[PDB]
Amino acid sequence: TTRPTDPPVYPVTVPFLGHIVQFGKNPLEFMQRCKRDLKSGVFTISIGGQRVTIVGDPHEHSRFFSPRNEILSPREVYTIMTPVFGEGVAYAAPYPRMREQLNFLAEELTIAKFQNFVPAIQHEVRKFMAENWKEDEGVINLLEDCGAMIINTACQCLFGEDLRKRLNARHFAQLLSKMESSLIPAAVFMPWLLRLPLPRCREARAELQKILGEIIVAREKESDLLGGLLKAVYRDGTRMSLHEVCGMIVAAMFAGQHTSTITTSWSMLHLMHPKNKKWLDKLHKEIDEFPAQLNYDNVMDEMPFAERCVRESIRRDPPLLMVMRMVKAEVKVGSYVVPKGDIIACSPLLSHHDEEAFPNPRLWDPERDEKVDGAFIGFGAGVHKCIGQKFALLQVKTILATAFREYDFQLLRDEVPDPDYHTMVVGPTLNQCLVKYTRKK
Numbered sequence: 001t002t003r004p005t006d007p008p009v010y011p012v013t014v015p016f017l018g019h020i021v022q023f024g025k026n027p028l029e030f031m032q033r034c035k036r037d038l039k040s041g042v043f044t045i046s047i048g049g050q051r052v053t054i055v056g057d058p059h060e061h062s063r064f065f066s067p068r069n070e071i072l073s074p075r076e077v078y079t080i081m082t083p084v085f086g087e088g089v090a091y092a093a094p095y096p097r098m099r100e101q102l103n104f105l106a107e108e109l110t111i112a113k114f115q116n117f118v119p120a121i122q123h124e125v126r127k128f129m130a131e132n133w134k135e136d137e138g139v140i141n142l143l144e145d146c147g148a149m150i151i152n153t154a155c156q157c158l159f160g161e162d163l164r165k166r167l168n169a170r171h172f173a174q175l176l177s178k179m180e181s182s183l184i185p186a187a188v189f190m191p192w193l194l195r196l197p198l199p200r201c202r203e204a205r206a207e208l209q210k211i212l213g214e215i216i217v218a219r220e221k222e223s224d225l226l227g228g229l230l231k232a233v234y235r236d237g238t239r240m241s242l243h244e245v246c247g248m249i250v251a252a253m254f255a256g257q258h259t260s261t262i263t264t265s266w267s268m269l270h271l272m273h274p275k276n277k278k279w280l281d282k283l284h285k286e287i288d289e290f291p292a293q294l295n296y297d298n299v300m301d302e303m304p305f306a307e308r309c310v311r312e313s314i315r316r317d318p319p320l321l322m323v324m325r326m327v328k329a330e331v332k333v334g335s336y337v338v339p340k341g342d343i344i345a346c347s348p349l350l351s352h353h354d355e356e357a358f359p360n361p362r363l364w365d366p367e368r369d370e371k372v373d374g375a376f377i378g379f380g381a382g383v384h385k386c387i388g389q390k391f392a393l394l395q396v397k398t399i400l401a402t403a404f405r406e407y408d409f410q411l412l413r414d415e416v417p418d419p420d421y422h423t424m425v426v427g428p429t430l431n432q433c434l435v436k437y438t439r440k441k
């Protein structure tokens with residue numbers, strides 16, 4: 001079964017690997033085991049004879065990230081999420097409707113769009129803090145409260161008043177919530193591997209669609225994200241259907257909700273920890289210079305340290321652990337060739353723990369730089385680099401800047417939380433994010 005060019009191979013049984021996943025075993029240790037015993041950063045896990053090739057050598061990142069869809073294809077490997085977004089909507093939109101739709105989305109999230117996003121995000125953060133952090137001091141779940149701030153501020157930024165009246169952020173976040181109710185690794189991993197349907201979350205879509213479809217008529221009967229998606233064309237002259245606009249609105253809120261929530265929480269948890277006083281003080285040296293009301297230029301271009309804070313949070317504990325493609329034509333990676341039919345993967349989690357690229361990788365050090373160019377991949381790279389990355393950072397950084405200007409925070413355990421590997425998109429353990437707020441003097 002070997003070819004003169006293939007990477008080293010580690011056989012596993014499906015049960016044995018199934019067991020590792022179901023039981024939420026640290027996936028970093030398993031991949032680091034493999035990287036060492038096979039003495040290669042590029043290596044294959046043969047599951048049921050089912051080849052998964054990992055680009056775990058940060059010097060080889062571009063070999064994963066740069067090829068076109070026709071060579072390394074995202075479609076086949078994410079097709080299981082189709083019920084999430086709908087049948088002809090993203091990874092399920094046939095060629096070339098997938099790239100066309102992602103690009104429409106991308107175009108709704110450029111820096112020309114962000115106009116008054118910042119004041120809008122500050123007002124929502126301050127409404128929240130005013131409604132929820134009312135006392136001189138009080139106890140909260142930081143993970144839960146960041147997620148609220150993330151949905152509220154996202155919807156305020158992206159949605160018009162008709163939308164926010166019919167579908168409030170609370171509602172939105174429930175509907176989103178009961179979808180990744182069926183995207184746990186323990187349940188998805190095996191049908192993802194076999195090529196089996198997603199094992200409830202199509203009921204939540206049909207609720208949204210009906211709701212949006214009403215909103216959508218109300219408007220055509222009578223410049224936000226919805227309105228921009230509604231104006232989108234396509235190469236062939238036709239526009240997106242209701243079903244496609246709903247699906248891309250979902251893909252959007254879905255993509256950014258859990259990832260940004262988690263990044264904000266890790267950032268705040270590191271910063272508040274007594275051993276990171278130096279950084280919190282550094283953070284203040286930067287943000288104490290600014291007025292009550294921030295602008296785009298303030299947050300995007302005059303907070304380099306806040307940004308390092310966010311970036312290193314995603315570096316140490318990236319929320320998307322692993323990014324995949326189907327190899328459609330064999331591809332050169334390092335001194336190996338990765339054959340047609342392989343699943344090829346590149347893992348932020350694995351590369352962000354490479355000792356050369358990120359020495360002492362468990363130390364959250366905001367002043368760190370990658371020691372191998374392009375080793376950091378928390379938002380991916382190349383053809384499929386994240387296109388909400390700028391909105392994400394504008395959002396998280398404004399929240400950090402707004403929350404730390406008014407409050408101090410005590411973490412109510414001794415150590416920063418354990419990541420919890422039981423969810424698809426990975427964050428700190430919920431019960432471990434209990435925190436005391438203290439209103440500034």
Ligand code: HEM
Binds near residue numbers: 324
């Ligand atoms: C902190 C927040 C975020 C993180 C950490 C993050 C992380 C990532 C990563 C690792 C990828 C690589 C995908 C791959 O190679 O398969 C990606 C892509 C992508 N992201 Fe994000 N992302 C974030 C926020 C968002 C937001 C807010 C949106 C939309 C509103 C978004 C939309 C997308 C899309 C459409 C792609 C891939 C497009 C394609 O397949 O060509 N992301 N993101």
Ligand SMILES: OC(Cn1cncn1)(Cn1cncn1)c1ccc(F)cc1F
Binds near residue numbers: 251256259323
């Ligand atoms: O890349 C994802 C899909 N994915 C990969 N593993 C689990 N889900 C996630 N993502 C990207 N940025 C933030 N989250 C994505 C790609 C496109 C999309 F529309 C949604 C979506 F979640």
